[PDB]
Amino acid sequence: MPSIENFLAYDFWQYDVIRHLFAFSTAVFLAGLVYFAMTARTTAPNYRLSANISAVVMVSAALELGQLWLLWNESFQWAELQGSFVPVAGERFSNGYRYMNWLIDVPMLATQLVVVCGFVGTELRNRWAKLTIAGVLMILTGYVGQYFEPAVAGVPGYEGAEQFWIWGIISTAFFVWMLLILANAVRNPQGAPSDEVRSRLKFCFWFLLATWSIYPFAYAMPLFAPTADGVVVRQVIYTVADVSSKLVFGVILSQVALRRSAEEGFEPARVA
Ligand SMILES: CCCCCCCCCCCCCCCCCCCC
Numbered sequence: 001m002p003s004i005e006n007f008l009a010y011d012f013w014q015y016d017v018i019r020h021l022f023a024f025s026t027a028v029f030l031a032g033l034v035y036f037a038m039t040a041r042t043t044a045p046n047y048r049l050s051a052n053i054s055a056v057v058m059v060s061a062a063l064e065l066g067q068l069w070l071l072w073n074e075s076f077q078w079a080e081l082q083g084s085f086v087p088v089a090g091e092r093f094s095n096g097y098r099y100m101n102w103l104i105d106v107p108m109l110a111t112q113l114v115v116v117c118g119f120v121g122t123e124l125r126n127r128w129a130k131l132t133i134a135g136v137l138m139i140l141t142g143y144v145g146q147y148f149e150p151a152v153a154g155v156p157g158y159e160g161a162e163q164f165w166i167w168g169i170i171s172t173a174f175f176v177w178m179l180l181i182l183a184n185a186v187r188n189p190q191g192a193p194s195d196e197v198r199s200r201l202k203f204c205f206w207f208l209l210a211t212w213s214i215y216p217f218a219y220a221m222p223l224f225a226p227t228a229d230g231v232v233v234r235q236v237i238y239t240v241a242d243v244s245s246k247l248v249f250g251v252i253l254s255q256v257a258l259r260r261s262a263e264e265g266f267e268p269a270r271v272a
Contacts, residue, residue, distance in 0.1 A: 002093075002094065003092075003093060003146070004150060004231065005093050005234075006092055008087075008227065009082065010076065010228050011084055014232050015076065017232055017235075018231070024239075025239055026069060033059065035251065036051050039051050043257050043266075043269065047257040050112040050115045053109075054253070056104065058246070061247075064101040068097065076093070095234075107131050107132040109245065110181070111124075111131055113185065113208060114127045114131070116260065117189045117201060118190030119190055123190075130177075138174035142219065145164050145170075147163065148163040152164045153222040186202050186204065186205040194263055197259055201256060211241060211244040212245060214244070215245075217237060218237045
């Protein structure tokens with residue numbers, strides 16, 4: 001179904017800002033690829049998977065925001081007499097498109113935290129399995145919910161506003177399940193981590209919780225019946241969430257993985 005973005009006209013500034021958010025984000029994630037490539041070589045073999053997962057998330061995210069950039073350009077047309085970008089008939093832009101690549105991002109971001117906690121073999125795979133089940137169900141139920149956001153925003157001729165709350169609350173339950181799995185992981189790190197590593201692992205959990213929590217906030221923006229300006233704010237919120245949850249989290253986690261590597265006597269990690 002059409003997202004709230006589809007029912008508004010945008011002045012040049014509003015349209016161009018949002019276009020730049022998508023382009024800039026794509027470029028930043030691609031650049032992140034270089035950092036994770038370099039950091040992988042200095043990480044111990046037992047923690048290198050985390051850096052590799054960050055690379056997978058950067059490519060997933062680049063394609064996410066790349067697609068939003070293309071859909072944004074294709075879904076609106078300059079109307080010279082109005083001096084505004086107006087929605088094209090038969091072309092629907094939706095943030096809902098981002099949900100598909102979340103199927104990669106969410107389980108992977110969760111799993112890489114578990115990897116740096118130092119879980120291996122069956123214990124790692126059990127947690128990956130549970131995080132993938134919870135994560136996929138969170139995203140699918142969320143997707144059903146956001147399908148009805150036009151009705152929530154009071155866009156005339158749209159119904160099913162209750163679906164937004166039903167499936168939103170269901171999705172939130174799956175989110176909490178994921179957070180409880182991860183809380184358990186960071187509370188019970190494997191090996192003999194320093195007090196510094198234990199504290200930094202908990203930091204990583206709470207940073208994931210904080211940045212992930214922005215996504216339900218962006219989900220809820222239709223409640224505020226936004227104008228074009230509110231849509232700009234919503235896409236800024238998503239950009240902060242995307243860059244913080246994927247790249248900044250990735251960098252912070254990579255530094256904990258390097259510390260664990262150094263503590264365990266991996267020389268290239270000590271040198272770095
Ligand atoms: C110290 C190691 C040497 C430096 C490595 C840095 C090289 C860059 C990272 C490698 C990634 C290149 C793979 C290209 C695929 C990108 C996908 C494009 C999506 C649109």
